């Protein structure tokens, strides 16, 4: 019953429609992202890995309304606990599996951070987060296989905060692209 993009290109085209206004239906975007069947023939040009850390690969600049990117998680790669700078954030599995750990926000006092939820994102599953949902850390479940995910942020942002799990203290971090439109950007 959901509009089903047959190709990554269809998906991008639909996303341009859904983010053209000032209202974004979160469940609708989520269902449409989820309905696209990951096809590595279509996104291999973006799947540029690094040995030591996950990479961010810009697919589409969404006419300033959103950023669409592909994250490549090597064996055992994972993120810090982080926020998402007041944007809508969608993340869809394209290959492998990611564990998402949702964390509560620290307050002023120093303290071990508190897990609110833990799950594995299944094949083609699209999850959603924003700052009001919580913080999270995302990581490849596998030490023998990669994971690949498709992330949509609206509006785009390129800074966020990383949090120390032991204290809740945070650091601003500039986020960078490993590649854009399939072209390395070193």
Which residues are known binding-site members for Fe cation?
82, 84, 136
Cβ within 8 Å of residue 3, ≥6 positions away: 14, 32, 35
Q: Which long-range contacts (CB under 8 A, 24 or more apart) does 155-159 make?
A: 155/64, 155/65, 155/66, 155/87, 156/61, 156/62, 156/64, 156/66, 156/67, 156/87, 157/84, 157/85, 157/86, 157/87, 159/85
CA distance 17 to 95: 26
Please answer whether residues 135 and 105 qualify as being in contact, where contact means their C-beta atoms are separated by less than 8 angstroms.
yes
Binding residues: 82, 84, 136
- SS3 label, residue 50: coil
Query: Nearest Cα to 67, choosing from 55, 59, 77?
Result: 59
**Sign (positive or negative) of CA dihedral 152, 154, 157, 160:** negative
């Amino acid at each position: 019953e959901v509009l089903k993009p047959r190709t990554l290109a269809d998906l991008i085209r639909i996303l341009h429609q859904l983010f053209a206004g000032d209202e974004v239906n979160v469940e609708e975007v989520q269902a449409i992202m989820e309905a696209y069947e990951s096809d590595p023939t279509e996104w291999a040009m973006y799947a540029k890995f690094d040995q030591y850390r996950y990479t961010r690969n810009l697919v589409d600049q969404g006419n300033g309304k959103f950023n669409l990117m592909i994250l490549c998680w090597g064996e055992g790669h994972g993120s810090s606990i982080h926020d998402h700078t007041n944007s809508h954030c969608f993340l869809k599995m394209l290959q492998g599996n990611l564990k998402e750990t949702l964390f509560a926000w620290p307050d002023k006092k120093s303290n071990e951070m508190v897990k609110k939820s833990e799950r594995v994102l299944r094949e083609n599953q699209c999850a959603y987060i924003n700052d009001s949902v919580g913080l999270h850390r995302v990581e490849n479940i596998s030490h023998t296989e990669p994971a690949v995910s498709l992330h949509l942020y609206s509006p785009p942002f390129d800074t966020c905060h990383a949090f120390d799990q032991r204290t809740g203290h945070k650091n601003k971090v500039t986020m960078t692209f490993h590649s854009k439109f399939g072209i390395r950007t070193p």
